[PDB]
């Protein structure tokens, strides 16, 4: 329904990258849907980094899979993405996403994205 | 392990014309695809889902056809608000992949 | 190939009152701030509906129930389901459920939703199944025994792949799904709605409006229908096939339709706030 991503600004090389996604207008628990993160570097290009489900069942992108973790804080409507180590080419603009739901039965999300939100910028060095 | 190529790049058009974009796959996906539009300084918004459909209240000047290894998108006419980059994405396997994008500008 | 499973207990069914619920949009026109009288097939207010369980318990005596009987269609069906996880999948419709006449099939199997109209030969106990592995801590699914002979198919529709949970929790129910099935002219019409709840037993009392979902041109003759469920199977249910299995926790309610006249009240956007019968 509505999202507002948040996080820090300038970072340091090979540190942990913090991030937070506060869902507004929707119960993060009273749902059966999926959530995900998406990256866009400056210039040209898009990449999908990870997708999560509440109460476990995490997935990760095959490329750059070693240093990525995703967590959800079910107490509030918040989830976070952690990078243990970063390089000089990891700077981009990051977005939250919601996976479009199923049509006939409910309880299911397709492999496509809708209802995004505004993005923040993370530099390097 | 799905790879895509988007053949047109930086097309120029006038206010009333017809423009077309093709997005080529490498595997044998079966009529599942998605198209995206990105106005500058915003977040992408969805335009067409599945092979050929439309969500929400996007103007009906947007329509594309489909096949098993080729795809296309064409718009009937332009307006001064149609100036952006368009993207194609697959909806088949776990490693989601995105296209290089194509730019449409008005002359 | 399919088998009969036999470790069931015995008990008679029950009945539960339906409150003011089961109304749907009867046409395509748009109105606002009006009181409109309509004649159509509806479900009467305060009417008997029938209750069906799927629950297994141990420790105290023996109580295992797994009910999916063959039921008549008459003029139409109102279907409601309450579940903590995904335990109902779909339906088979037909008139003789044998190889001499056509049938209709709607099924979900955790990757795709399949709609078929075809000649089949269903066997006595159709069911789907899952498995719980200890080494994986994963709920992987492999079972499909619903028919043994399909031929001469006319319509076929297979949908876009998706993901879904199969975990299976314990506690209070937290979903409610309602469907309405009607067969008129040469057309099959399906309406649906979903809502969240936090009950422990029985059907909620309130009001909701149903919206059109699917219209299919098929042209079959329908007189009876049956339900399909899913059952678990793990290391804690020993024995052998047809005698080793456990049930989950789910329930559903069924009711029929009759020709009535109603006085619906539209809102200032086009939503049916309430209704009255006579
Ligand atoms: C399952 O139980 C039925 C109960 O009679 C067994 O009998 C078959 O019932 C079906 C009706 O759905 C008939 O079409 C078959 O001709 C019956 N077979 C026989 C041999 O009488 C059925 O065999 C059982 N299935 C098994 C044991 O696999
Ligand atoms: C769920 O049922 C669908 C029914 O279509 C299955 O889809 C077919 O699966 C076979 C299995 O190898 C494939 O060869 C076909 O190509 C699939 N059909 C289409 C149209 O792609 C699906 O595999 C089933 N899934 C599970 C987990 O049982
Ligand atoms: C519902 O059924 C019960 C028993 O089956 C019956 O006693 C009761 O009168 C019925 N309710 C009606 C007919 O409104
Ligand atoms: C699940 O268990 C099977 C059997 O041991 C194994 O082959 C598989 O790798 C495990 N993980 C899955 C299916 O994700
Ligand atoms: C459907 O088939 C049954 C089979 O006996 C038949 O009696 C009936 O007339 C047919 N048509 C309808 C509308 O039920």
Author numbering:
A (entry chain H): 2 to 126
B (entry chain L): 1 to 107
C (entry chain B): 14 to 291
Give me lines lifted from the publication on this model:
The viral spike glycoprotein is both the attachment factor that binds angiotensin-converting enzyme 2 (ACE2) on host cells and the viral fusogen that mediates the fusion of the viral membrane with that of the host cell. The spike glycoprotein is the main target of neutralizing antibody responses and, hence, the focus of most vaccines. We isolated a germ line-encoded monoclonal antibody (mAb) from plasmablasts activated upon mRNA vaccination against severe acute respiratory syndrome coronavirus 2 (SARS-CoV-2) and determined its structure in complex with the spike glycoprotein by electron cryomicroscopy (cryo-EM). We show that the mAb engages a previously uncharacterized neutralizing epitope on the spike N-terminal domain (NTD).
